[PDB]
């Protein structure tokens, strides 16, 4: 089977429309993969200590931990940019109210392994041969024994471009640490910070081996391989954003003065307080909007920029990413700043490497702590500098840490919204944390597999031994080998169409003569895949 | 079939649990094998005489014998380290009361033969080609015509590591010797030691030939090969150790004084001798523990460090390996000192080669000769220096050879225990000595095949002749060739789970923060496979 | 309950007998008995 092709290339995007308004969005993604021969044929247990970690203030910069570096490379296509292209997104987000994960199947084919012979005859000349017989190692951890490691959050996914080759990344998992950083400091002060790390508590050591946990298929040029057909069990994802806030829930207080002159300038009048009727979660006989009965709490302040410390070290306490307020805050509203790559958007040509861009979901929930505040005992419209905590009050003596930094408003009354899909660098589905009690969602991605997540796809070039034996020695020498093999995946979703219910037209992402540039190549061949808002369709909340 | 893979890699360890508490421990072992082209295409009959052999005292150092060196290489996977890994062992030994050999099957695949062309163009450059057509010779001695030669006892097994390549060893058997060493000496003395050897008595010459006794399969890259499915007939192996000794068998003498104060310090009292009742294998009306009726003899002294001499020369008389006593003796209790290898445990990285470590089974039987003794005629509690042989008495005039060195206590009353499995360097099953009367066990391994043992797997690279003819000449010249071919074996056992019968918890092999290091790679890729106790579950004996 | 199985390479925690604790699982020369508490949930588990 040497001279015959095993699989087929296809990167089409099929949108089947069915009855009652559903759609079978079928995304085909093919891509030419390139794999280099693992440079260290062993399993290494490496630690990581950075000089920066152990300095006054630079604690947040701590990078310590332990790595299990495997000789295997991983093929993760879990990231929107893989499946869709700009146009696709525009369609889906501009018209589907919800979308959900259905089936997924990969397939590796037209494997080609290549030897490289050196010819230092005057100038270093390279000769390329085909080791027809050599093999490509492929492993599929169906049961997820190997620690899960999504690539997406490190833009180490496959190339978001069908006409451009791409590389799978080095597989390496976390191993128990015993990180020490006592005690925290502050930029200036002189103190002796202890900075250590020693492979975790023995009882917590997890040392896995591709070889030991999964059957490995050997693939010669004429061989082929294919995932079965995995079916997701996932809570559908909404592609609509809420807006209403507690100050916009329910029956608006009836007015007594409708304006008499055009312009959003002139407003209407409400009867004085006192004379108003209804419920009150406060005592004063006066019913204000800020102080009014609402169904629940839409949103919540999560102590921002708080660092917690557990065995593995210190770390930022995650915040459910929601849209910022008119006071572009971001960090407290879990905004997510992605960094691009010469392969995940960002002009292929550009001289400077990678790109910035921060992301803010559309669902309005977030807060503006630089505004929030607290008052004492019986409220009292008309504060008491003494009986009122403000967004500019010194907590614990530090003149810039205000109450909001420590304030947590989560409660049974809280109504929250899930992360947003972030085309394209965004992760798509995610394994669920195997803890007795589970999280209501993840920040990583919008889809969490209720059951068992799809399998990790592993790859590694079969060691091409020489005549200089093996064993009875440290690191064995081998023929320089590499591989070019294709890959085709099929991700299938389900979504519902939207419909005209209101009077006014809504948001929709379009082309402006000032952005087409971003969806069109360059006079040289530059291509971008700059991220786009998602969940842009307005939705009632109450 | 050039570009297609023949077999599949799998080194998983399946533990199926069935009814009534049995387990189908199925061990899959795959490994990339590397074979070099036999350097001497003939069958050589070599002798071996060491200078050390013929010197005063250094007799024990005798290495003489005769070798039949074949051009074939052997693939022996008979050794625990092949099949299981540290974790596996911990599980099996920590929970199975017994285990037994069931089925076994090998399979060679993805054969690849390679030519190596020289290019001494300035610096010696190597060019690697594929002799697609050349073949790999494989022979399976199903009926065991070729002399059996387990690799295990010479740590020449396959590599105990799935992610590391390995080499099969040179096959060479013993051939009749007529070793002469008359007469024994002692380090100092001047005497004329005759040291000779001449290929054994003609009537005892056994000259085998792979070619002449077994059909050989030729394998081209696209070929495959597989053992059938051999079934063992073996006495199950206990994974529990006995403890009770003759001084701990049966009904303990009833006491008459139970202690009144806490602490293992204060003991209880037994009525004086005389007044005691029962059997006695002695005359005195006084019944002592040392001199008390017991069911049988648990253990036995085997004349230690005794050297016997038969045709092939002198040699140490084997001792059933049992645990040492509180007087760490070892040698007299057949302890087994294994020597590791850069491929059978022992840090791959370490600068020093190989490792030490001695082994002591758990079943308590062994003795402490430096304690034993003998008394005369009617016993008599209260010796006679004259009527009492002691552990420090000069035998035959030599001031350091005491009676124990010559003492053999084996008898019909002897109750003995079988060798222990020694993970991982330990041999697993073993051929039975074809003598009219058989041994009750072997020391080599714990499993002895009642029927015919599995077949020896032979390998050798098909001679890649050149254009410089052959025959009509001594040693023929040929193209330098070698091979990389995979191998997968499937060893299946049966074992029973343990159960809580007593009150107290028992031994169990665990992780201490002081040993995980041994089950975890190194920051460079070092791996160890240090041996572990086995048979660690306590067992009643009576 | 469900049995455990060898998935990884390394052996794990396990509660055993040390010559320094058997005392706690054995009566006294007078009849003393202890039932000192022991760790539980001692088998390592992946979380992600």
């Amino acid at each position: 089977g040497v001279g015959v092709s095993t699989g087929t290339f296809n990167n089409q995007t099929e949108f089947q429309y069915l009855g009652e308004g559903l759609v079978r969005i079928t995304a085909h993604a093919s891509r030419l993969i390139h794999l280099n021969m693992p440079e260290h044929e062993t399993y290494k247990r490496i630690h990581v200590l950075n000089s920066e970690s152990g300095v006054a203030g630079q604690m947040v910069q701590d990078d310590a931990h332990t790595q299990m570096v495997t000789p295997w490379s991983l093929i993760d296509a879990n990231a929107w940019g893989v499946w869709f292209n700009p146009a696709d997104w525009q369609l889906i987000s501009n018209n589907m109210t919800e979308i959900n994960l259905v089936s997924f199947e990969q397939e590796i084919f037209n494997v080609v392994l290549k030897t490289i012979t050196e010819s230092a005859t005057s100038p270093p000349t390279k000769i390329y041969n085909n080791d027809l017989t050599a093999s490509l190692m492929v492993a599929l951890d169906t049961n997820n024994t190997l620690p899960y490691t999504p690539a997406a959050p490190r833009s180490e996914t496959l190339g978001f471009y069908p006409w451009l080759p791409t590389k799978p990344t080095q597989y390496r998992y976390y191993l128990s640490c015993i990180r020490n950083l006592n005690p925290p400091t502050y930029t200036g002060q002189s103190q002796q910070i202890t900075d250590s790390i020693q492979t975790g508590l023995h009882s917590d050591i997890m040392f896995y081996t591709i070889e030991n946990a999964v059957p490995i298929h050997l693939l010669r040029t004429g061989d082929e391989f294919s995932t079965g057909i995995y079916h997701f069990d996932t809570k559908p994802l909404k592609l609509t954003h809420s807006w209403q806030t507690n100050r916009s829930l329910g029956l608006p207080p009836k007015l007594l003065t409708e304006p008499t002159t055009e312009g959003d300038q002139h407003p209407g009048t409400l009867p004085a307080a006192n004379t108003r009727k209804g419920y009150h979660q406060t005592i004063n006989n006066s019913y204000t909007e800020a102080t009014a009965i609402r169904p629940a709490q839409v949103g919540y302040n999560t102590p921002y920029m708080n660092f917690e410390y557990s065995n593995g070290g210190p770390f930022l306490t995650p915040i459910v990413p929601t849209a910022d307020t008119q006071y572009n805050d971001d960090e407290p509203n879990g905004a997510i700043r992605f960094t691009m790559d010469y392969q995940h958007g960002h002009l292929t040509t550009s001289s400077q490497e990678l790109e910035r861009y921060t992301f803010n979901p559309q669902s309005k929930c977030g807060r503006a702590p630089k505004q929030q505040f607290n008052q004492q005992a019986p409220l009292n419209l008309e504060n008491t500098n003494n009986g009122t905590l403000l967004p500019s009050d010194p907590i614990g003596g530090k003149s810039n840490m205000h109450f909001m930094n420590t304030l947590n408003t989560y409660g049974p009354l809280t109504a929250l919204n899930n992360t947003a899909p972030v085309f394209p660098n965004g992760q798509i589905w995610d394994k669920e944390l195997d803890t007795d009690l589970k999280p209501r969602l993840h920040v990583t991605a919008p889809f969490v597999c209720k059951n068992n997540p799809p399998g990790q796809l592993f790859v590694k070039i079969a060691p091409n031994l020489t005549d200089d034996f093996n064993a009875d020695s440290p690191q064995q020498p081998r023929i320089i080998t590499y591989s070019n093999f294709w890959w085709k995946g099929t991700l299938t979703f389900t979504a519902k169409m939207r419909s005209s219910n209101m009077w006014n037209p809504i948001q929709q992402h379009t082309t402006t003569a000032e952005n087409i540039g971003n969806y069109i190549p360059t006079n040289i061949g530059g291509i971008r895949m700059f991220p786009e808002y998602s969940q842009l369709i307005p939705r009632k909340l109450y």
Side-chain angles (χ1 to χ4, degrees), chain A:
Chain A
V2 49
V4 180
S5 290
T6 67
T8 232
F9 179 106
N10 184 317
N11 208 283
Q12 287 180 169
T13 315
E14 287 176 56
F15 278 93
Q16 281 167 48
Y17 287 72
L18 296 79
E20 303 171 5
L22 311 196
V23 288
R24 191 163 286 288
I25 304 179
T26 292
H28 292 300
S30 297
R31 217 131 296 182
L32 169 56
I33 295 182
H34 174 287
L35 175 64
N36 264 152
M37 168 180 59
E39 85 173 309
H40 253 299
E41 279 289 313
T42 325
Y43 278 102
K44 300 181 132 197
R45 179 173 104 293
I46 305 180
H47 282 302
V48 167
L49 264 177
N50 46 327
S51 316
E52 313 92 308
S53 192
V55 177
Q58 310 186 339
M59 320 152 55
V60 187
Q61 297 189 57
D62 155 39
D63 298 307
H65 65 286
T66 298
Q67 272 199 26
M68 250 334 294
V69 167
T70 78
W72 290 79
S73 309
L74 183 176
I75 299 182
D76 193 64
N78 180 50
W80 305 95
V82 169
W83 313 89
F84 314 98
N85 58 63
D88 296 317
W89 201 256
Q90 172 193 50
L91 182 62
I92 310 172
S93 43
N94 250 34
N95 251 284
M96 325 288 208
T97 72
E98 69 166 54
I99 178 190
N100 191 53
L101 232 22
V102 192
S103 71
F104 165 62
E105 78 180 70
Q106 312 189 45
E107 166 175 38
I108 283 180
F109 64 112
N110 272 221
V111 184
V112 180
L113 299 186
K114 279 189 173 179
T115 254
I116 182 175
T117 301
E118 188 86 49
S119 177
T121 178
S122 9
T125 304
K126 290 188 171 183
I127 317 175
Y128 307 80
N129 278 78
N130 301 60
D131 209 275
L132 304 152
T133 55
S135 327
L136 163 51
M137 290 194 263
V138 188
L140 198 275
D141 179 25
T142 327
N143 301 181
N144 288 314
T145 305
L146 304 196
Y148 204 61
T149 54
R154 278 172 152 60
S155 202
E156 289 193 56
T157 316
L158 274 52
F160 303 166
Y161 298 115
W163 58 98
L164 294 182
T166 183
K167 299 214 69 180
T169 82
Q170 180 174 65
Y171 177 45
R172 68 287 184 176
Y173 49 104
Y174 281 123
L175 197 174
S176 191
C177 316
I178 280 191
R179 180 48 184 305
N180 277 290
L181 256 187
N182 51 284
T185 89
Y186 69 82
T187 283
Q189 66 172 170
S190 62
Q191 230 293 320
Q192 197 172 60
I193 25 67
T194 324
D195 183 24
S196 79
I197 203 172
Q198 337 154 49
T199 33
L201 285 171
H202 68 279
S203 53
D204 301 0
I205 253 56
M206 302 280 254
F207 177 41
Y208 292 104
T209 274
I210 300 246
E211 286 81 345
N212 260 299
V214 171
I216 308 166
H217 292 64
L218 294 192
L219 297 194
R220 293 185 169 182
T221 179
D223 285 311
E224 160 216 51
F225 172 89
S226 56
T227 315
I229 319 168
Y230 171 62
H231 301 290
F232 297 93
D233 190 325
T234 49
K235 301 148 186 171
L237 190 175
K238 304 245 179 187
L239 309 187
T240 49
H241 64 300
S242 62
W243 57 275
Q244 301 169 292
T245 33
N246 292 55
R247 284 298 293 296
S248 331
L249 285 186
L251 190 62
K254 183 184 179 175
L255 355 68
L256 101 139
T257 307
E258 303 183 5
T260 315
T261 345
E262 275 234 325
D264 296 324
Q265 315 167 290
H266 321 170
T269 317
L270 295 179
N274 335 323
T275 9
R276 303 175 178 188
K277 11 177 172 172
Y279 301 14
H280 218 24
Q281 205 168 50
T282 78
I283 302 181
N284 47 132
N285 217 285
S286 43
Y287 305 88
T288 306
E289 277 311 77
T291 62
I293 268 298
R294 296 320 205 308
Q297 167 176 47
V298 170
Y300 71 107
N301 307 300
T302 328
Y304 63 132
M305 304 326 306
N306 184 282
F307 283 51
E308 298 175 359
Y309 196 96
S310 178
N311 289 275
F315 63 74
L316 180 165
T317 309
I319 340 291
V320 155
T322 288
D324 63 41
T325 156
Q326 319 125 56
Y327 303 33
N328 240 276
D329 284 305
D330 302 322
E331 295 227 355
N333 291 302
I336 307 169
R337 173 122 168 163
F338 302 71
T339 249
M340 307 292 264
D341 182 14
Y342 265 57
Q343 179 169 54
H344 302 64
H346 176 59
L347 280 169
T348 342
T349 58
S350 112
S351 47
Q352 170 187 43
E353 289 189 357
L354 21 160
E355 192 70 305
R356 52 226 156 194
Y357 116 82
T358 307
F359 181 79
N360 283 312
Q362 284 279 296
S363 297
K364 275 71 181 183
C365 311
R367 303 297 173 55
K370 292 179 181 180
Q371 231 291 179
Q372 307 238 164
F373 60 104
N374 207 303
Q375 285 180 38
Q376 237 299 64
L379 229 194
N380 196 298
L381 340 304
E382 277 180 354
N383 307 297
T384 314
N385 181 41
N386 305 303
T388 307
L389 215 76
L390 274 76
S392 48
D393 288 324
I395 300 307
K398 302 304 175 73
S399 69
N400 204 26
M401 297 302 291
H402 315 154
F403 88 71
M404 306 102 272
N405 290 130
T406 271
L407 188 257
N408 181 328
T409 59
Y410 189 25
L413 287 168
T414 298
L416 174 52
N417 249 39
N418 200 307
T419 305
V422 209
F423 175 86
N425 319 278
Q427 187 181 295
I428 300 190
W429 60 76
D430 194 32
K431 174 181 188 167
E432 178 50 290
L433 290 178
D434 196 46
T435 69
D436 290 301
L437 304 169
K438 306 180 179 185
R440 307 190 67 179
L441 76 176
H442 291 185
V443 281
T444 325
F447 289 118
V448 184
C449 311
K450 282 182 172 180
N451 64 317
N452 177 209
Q456 299 255 52
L457 182 55
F458 297 105
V459 151
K460 161 193 170 198
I461 298 191
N464 215 358
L465 311 171
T466 59
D467 53 306
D468 284 299
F469 94 165
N470 300 297
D472 300 72
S473 76
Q475 226 212 307
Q476 15 85 313
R478 57 282 172 53
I479 291 175
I480 320 165
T481 311
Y482 78 85
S483 178
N484 287 349
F485 65 89
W486 304 74
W487 166 97
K488 178 178 65 182
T490 302
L491 188 42
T492 300
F493 301 79
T494 260
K496 186 169 186 178
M497 298 304 279
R498 69 193 212 71
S499 56
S500 172
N501 240 317
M502 45 212 297
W503 167 272
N504 65 79
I506 65 186
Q507 190 173 206
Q508 288 278 60
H509 152 272
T510 183
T511 311
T512 78
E514 322 175 6
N515 66 43
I516 356 66
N518 301 178
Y519 309 110
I520 284 178
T522 254
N523 56 305
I524 304 187
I527 309 153
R528 322 166 163 64
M529 250 259 232
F530 281 107
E532 288 161 47
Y533 305 65
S534 69
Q535 282 189 309
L536 58 191
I537 307 182
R539 167 183 60 158
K540 270 176 305 169
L541 224 180
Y542 189 81

